Amino acid sequence: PQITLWQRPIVTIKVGGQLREALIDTGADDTIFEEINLPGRWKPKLIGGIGGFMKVRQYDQIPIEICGHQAIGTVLVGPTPINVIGRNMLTQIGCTLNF
Amino acid sequence: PQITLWQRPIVTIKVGGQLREALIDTGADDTIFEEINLPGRWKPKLIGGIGGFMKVRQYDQIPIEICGHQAIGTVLVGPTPINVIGRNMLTQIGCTLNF
Ligand SMILES: CC(C)CN(C[C@@H](O)[C@H](Cc1ccccc1)NC(=O)O[C@H]1[C@H]2CO[C@H]3OC[C@@H]1[C@H]3C2)S(=O)(=O)c1ccc2nc(NC3CC3)sc2c1
Numbered sequence: 001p002q003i004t005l006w007q008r009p010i011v012t013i014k015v016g017g018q019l020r021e022a023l024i025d026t027g028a029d030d031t032i033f034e035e036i037n038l039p040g041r042w043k044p045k046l047i048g049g050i051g052g053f054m055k056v057r058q059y060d061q062i063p064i065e066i067c068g069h070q071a072i073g074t075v076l077v078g079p080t081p082i083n084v085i086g087r088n089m090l091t092q093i094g095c096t097l098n099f
Numbered sequence: 100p101q102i103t104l105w106q107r108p109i110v111t112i113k114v115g116g117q118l119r120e121a122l123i124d125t126g127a128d129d130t131i132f133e134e135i136n137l138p139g140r141w142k143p144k145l146i147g148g149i150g151g152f153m154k155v156r157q158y159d160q161i162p163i164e165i166c167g168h169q170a171i172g173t174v175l176v177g178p179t180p181i182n183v184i185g186r187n188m189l190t191q192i193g194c195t196l197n198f
Contacts (some may be wrong), residue, residue, distance in 0.1 A: 005194060026123055027122050027127055065152050087105075095198040096197050
């Protein structure tokens with residue numbers, strides 16, 4: 001759909017067989033969830049934001065459904081304050097900015 | 100214009116008489132710049148992100164030009180890794196998400 005920005009642009013997602021809410025985040029290169037349980041092998045990764053860096057687990061080739069749209073890609077798991085859908089997934093569902 | 104997300108959605112802004120580049124950031128409630136010199140009174144503020152909290156100066160009712168569009172609002176100044184235009188300004192210029 002079209003989403004205005006008067007409120008946080010939060011959408012419902014399905015990942016790893018679990019349901020979560022996440023922020024559509026154009027300022028995020030990558031996609032980050034707190035407290036999901038994904039299968040398989042992962043790589044430790046350090047990522048930087050406001051306030052410094054945080055350690056995450058990097059999982060590759062993870063299917064995700066984002067407001068009804070299917071995608072597959074890297075998902076980072078770590079102690080983010082809010083789950084974020086970043087550009088690596090937003091490009092797959094055709095998300096654009098308009099003004 | 101329309102902006103796709105294959106690259107970071109960086110735009111040119113004018114604020115405090117200075118020219119900067121900034122990321123259009125739908126995941127940001129507020130607007131944050133590193134190293135700009137704004138006039139007048141400010142109040143200290145702590146804000147949270149990935150990796151923890153950071154101290155910023157909060158300046159209110161600051162005029163800003165964002166890719167040619169005029170707005171006025173709160174601008175935070177502090178050691179962010181990249182300048183971000185958040186929803187407090189994006190709503191003023193009519194920015195929306197589309198997919
Ligand atoms: C900082 C920004 C440049 C990047 N971020 C995305 C932002 O959209 C972030 C989302 C968020 C919201 C809430 C809490 C935590 C985070 N927003 C934020 O921190 O906003 C803050 C402050 C601003 O106003 C209020 O609104 C929310 C609060 C609050 C005060 S990220 O998460 O660090 C981030 C995300 C993905 C990512 N991928 C990388 N890959 C590597 C490169 C190859 S690096 C990387 C960094």
